[PDB]
Design a protein around this ligand. Sequence first.
Ligand SMILES: [Mg+2]
Ligand SMILES: [Mg+2]
Lengths: 49, 548, 548, 48
Amino acid sequence: SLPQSEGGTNFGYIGVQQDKRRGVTQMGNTNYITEATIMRPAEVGYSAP
Amino acid sequence: GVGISTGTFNNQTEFKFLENGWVYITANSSRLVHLNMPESENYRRVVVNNLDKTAVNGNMALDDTHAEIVTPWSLVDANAWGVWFNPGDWQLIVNTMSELHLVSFEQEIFNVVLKTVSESATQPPTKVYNNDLTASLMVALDSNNTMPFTPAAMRSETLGFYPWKPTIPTPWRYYFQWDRTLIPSHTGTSGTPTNIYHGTDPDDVQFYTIENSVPVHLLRTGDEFATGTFFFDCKPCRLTHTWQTNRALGLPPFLNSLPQSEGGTNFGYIGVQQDKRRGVTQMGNTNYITEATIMRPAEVGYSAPYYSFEASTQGPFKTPIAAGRGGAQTDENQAADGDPRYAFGRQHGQKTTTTGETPERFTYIAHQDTGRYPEGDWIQNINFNLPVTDDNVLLPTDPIGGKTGINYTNIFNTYGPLTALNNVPPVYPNGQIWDKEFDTDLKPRLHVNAPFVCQNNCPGQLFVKVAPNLTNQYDPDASANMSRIVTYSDFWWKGKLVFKAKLRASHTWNPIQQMSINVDNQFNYVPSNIGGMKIVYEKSQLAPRKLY
Amino acid sequence: GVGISTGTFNNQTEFKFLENGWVYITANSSRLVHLNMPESENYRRVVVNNLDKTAVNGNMALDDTHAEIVTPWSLVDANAWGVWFNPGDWQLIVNTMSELHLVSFEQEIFNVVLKTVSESATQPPTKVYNNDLTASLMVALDSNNTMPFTPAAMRSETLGFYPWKPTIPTPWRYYFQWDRTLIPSHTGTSGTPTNIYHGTDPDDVQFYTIENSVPVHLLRTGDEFATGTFFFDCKPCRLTHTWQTNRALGLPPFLNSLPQSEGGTNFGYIGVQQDKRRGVTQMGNTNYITEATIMRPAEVGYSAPYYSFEASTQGPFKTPIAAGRGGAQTDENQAADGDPRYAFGRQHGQKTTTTGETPERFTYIAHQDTGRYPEGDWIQNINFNLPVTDDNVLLPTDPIGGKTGINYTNIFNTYGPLTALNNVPPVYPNGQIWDKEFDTDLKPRLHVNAPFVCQNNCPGQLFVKVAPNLTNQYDPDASANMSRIVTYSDFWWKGKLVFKAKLRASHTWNPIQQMSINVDNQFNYVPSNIGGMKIVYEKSQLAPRKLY
Amino acid sequence: AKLRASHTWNPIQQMSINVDNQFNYVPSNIGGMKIVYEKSQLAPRKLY
Ligand SMILES: [Mg+2]
Ligand SMILES: [Mg+2]
């Protein structure tokens, strides 16, 4: 779902239920595939004390 | 010209054996590819923002907020094992060979066809499809890797895995920069935790176009496009799993008392008091030397945070894990080992007769025992006065920060200069094959999506696009609709991926793990009463290795 | 032949660096071009005459009266900076390089397609477009420059500035001679001041046709046409602006008293009586030696009449102005300095989503401070008895010829043998790039529409036209007009423009003017939620130079 | 060092002056003067 007017809240939508999407995650439990869940090849940066 | 084919279909897989047991695996792959004209001939910056779900509190992990450039170009990605091998092939490779090198990759596009739909013609009223001979298909190969690398395997959007079933590319799209804050919360946190999309850091803006970076070729029916042959350079990938954890490295303790009848409780006994034993440990206090105490040369595998999420500039994201598997008999922390989970549809494995929007799934648990079972972790006090007091030990049962469902292992990390690791195993068939390396000054010791990483140069991405087939009325000065004849293309794609592998040898008295069928199992490898069919995930590192 | 492409899309911009910092900028450009058959296959002499607006009295400046030859040919003009560089390109050029030479220019036409409409088939009833394989596209290249020069940049009618957005040529037309008198007037003026179009000086009649002057190529689908490589010869265009006006040329006067605390009104003082000072002036009378008085080697810039209109054979026209900019902070008299003003549409910069026929506009105010601020002008009497009497000075306040709104600066002209000038700065993206030189025995020292002027010979203009696709009923002897099959063509255009530039170098302690983004501004360079998009005015001569 | 090249449609961050800023780079009424910290990695790259 792509927007059909310009503007600041005219968002686009992925358009598939979060638990029925196709793709790869490192979460053996859920079928949730979201931008925060989705696998990435590695990790950029690191957290330190 | 028109009536003259420009290529040959070949989905044949060749194994050429050489001397010193080197094999030369030539995987050929061919597909018919279908492509429609773009939704619009324009580039778009679109923002997705599900406050809809994130504002709920405790639904942070459901964040989909991002920005994206939607291009009128489509991507031909064949970067997945299933494009190149059928199961029988994978059987052969996996049971019989000890390592695997990635050598070369070439591909071409041929027998291009373009048809225009149009139209309402005629009798209740029907549609009819004609050839536009003079029409063109746009092809562009980003051989310089000018453009964002987007492996389609991650979204299970590669080419189809079946040679006799046609397939499609995917609309190309790439990340555009966005700032973003999303503050964590639980069901209880109320008030409204800040959950905002700030915009775009101008210092980070990069808008790419195919047109300005890559030479574009127009292919009519009689035209053909072929790439060079690209030669890879990466490490070898091994087809053997290691089974030893720290507890099985080196010289086991001599048993002074050996069993003297067969049976299931007829144990052997070390036969020396645990505090009167000889050996080396890193425990300066006690004179206890036991199998969990005894020194080992280094550490196999590592402990990592789970399910850890970290956040930078563009929002929160999961912390990735390398190892696995680590748990005993059929019990694993599929998160502490970060065992990857693949969701895919019909084109890539699901039963092709299955109706419904729900994807097929599985969780790959590697054979290589290098992970952790944090349930078994613990931490004692310096004094090692044992049996240990509750106050002198920290268990994976004791809550941390006063949360019932959180313990120390969730934040734990034992990566260190003594850490040993293997690379990820190939995940057949939905796995990625190779992946480009990060252009960072210091690089990851591996990637978790693919075993082959190109430090050199990687094959450029291949993009296709139906050329604008205009009608007679076109006014560019007009804001109004791009007026185009409905046009689409069929073209064939052939690729050649070459490996160089090495045959295994029997080093033990006992036999080993290998694929087969099986009275179970047997029905995942044949079609059905109707036109089948299914492709099943199936491991890769079946034979044991030997760490130490 | 039919199904075989005859060219390659390339809109790629290559920057190839050589020794001693000479760079070899090869700007490639490609567009898909759309073209309909002529409105009639005939040449027409049409006259325009707006007595409706000129007879108004006080409306002399609104004259549009002229004569014109309308040709069945269309013009493919690529003469505009926006055709060749995107902002990213332009940024590089302007910020890092000091001058710019024009080297070579070639173009070709390929993958021609001709389609016939016709239409009517069937039910509600809709229209349908088929390929005419045997149909031809006429292409003619006027390499001898036989025909009137019509740079389209002046009417914002060049090719599109977006690679992925198709475009069109513009209908060709040229000026045909006409005599014309129009007497100026104001609102108060009685009677009807004479306002007539007398007709056409037979001694000055020139009727040109493509057919009789230029070789014409017929291109069917499989044909292609390429021009040679044209090599320019011109002066360099500089990418640095000069900041010095007369008031800052040479040795500043010695300060005998320097301030001794920081601050905003802690000025320094020369410390010598203005009439007891040493130096050279061009004032034979006084012994006053001041900064506005002290001699300078010559004069930077010149004063010009504004808004001056002059009239010849064919009517009135504005007197054009060279220099600019001349005023201080944020106030510049955009007419005394003749700052140019650009109007353009969607294809060339205006937001492509904007509906309505109102064009986007801007006024280019150059960085090079070489203009005038006539409010600051004045003229003293020979005697220089000052403070000056009202009788001895002529101000830009004192009315001339008894008009409240007119002063001497409106007719003033200080061009002279001591005048120093720069050439016009490039106007990205709507500015013209190169321009033909007048075939007058004596030539202008510059042009205001473009920085590069071919005194050699300029590239020929390129003309296209759909060939007459006749129906079976055709009678040339017949007065009724030609019934032709409705035909149109899509063809691809590729051009290559090569520059040779030189890298600048830092010679000052301070940094300098350079383009960037910017939390403002940042959004003129990316598409939108829908298909974008916009190209914005962006200067050209950013880094300072030095006159003297 | 090595010269950069434009890879995007958009322009990018780069140093300049600036109606602000402009007075940190010239001396003063007296003998100036000041030198100001100023970053270094202005142009975008691309990780992946
Ligand atoms: Mg095991
Ligand atoms: Mg200035």
